[PDB]
Amino acid sequence: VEVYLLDTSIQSDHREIEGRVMVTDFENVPEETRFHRQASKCDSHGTHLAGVVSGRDAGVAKGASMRSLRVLNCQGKGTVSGTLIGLEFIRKSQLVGPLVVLLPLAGGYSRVLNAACQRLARAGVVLVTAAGNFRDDACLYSPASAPEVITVGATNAQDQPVGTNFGRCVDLFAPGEDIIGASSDCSTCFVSQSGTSQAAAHVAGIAAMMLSAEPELTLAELRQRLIHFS
């Protein structure tokens, strides 16, 4: 099973994730101070999430195989069109085992982004996304609002909402407060981060392990098992 990550650039040789992430050719980001454009800052978000999924010391699915697509710039900003072209890149790679697609990003409700996610889900892809960090109804954001995507809100150790988006479009809540993971500040550095991106990466790791054990596990079965174990 492979976990595809659509996010910022990654520090692929950070010791926590070295060997896990196959950086793909894909890059589609909007235009980019010098400090904020250094690699250690550009790579921060995606490197932390690749660690949450696959990291040796702190991964949920330690040793998981990942593939990365760059859809967010050094400031963590992307476009719906770049994200769409990234999702098409994944579909083309699939047409040429089970696949998990992790989308730790959000914009406003988008008909086309939801439609693209729906087409991948209809083809058997398991998509996992962040509910959003706006203390608002996740139905107003995308891909969070897509019913075919597993939308993940963030809770703490006491199951309290971290703030996290909520509502009928959130399928489950997962750990998203002070999550220790790989820091791109240095090759062995770690940092704690909070957010629905971290919660979604946790669920992607659980899904990857469930699909590895039961390759014939469908999205409908998997979804209910993930919701229950939350």
Add this chain to the structure above:
Amino acid sequence: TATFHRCAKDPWRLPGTYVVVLKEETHLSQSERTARRLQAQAARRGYLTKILHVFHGLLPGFLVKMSGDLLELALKLPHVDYIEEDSSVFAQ
């Protein structure tokens, strides 16, 4: 019958770039012909357009950089299902 869509969060809108989504089962050759018709009609009206990407495999359609003044014209192209103005997404 085609509809226009844009981000409800005004600060995240990116006017000037649009995803033109064609009806299901529209072939790649028809997506290319529809993009060519849009460019020709926009040129006849005195507007520059640029096709940035042609979609095929997941959804049929294309990404176009053009003035929003051309939206009424583009919505009338017969294979169009809907048109969406680009918008920003962010790391969570």
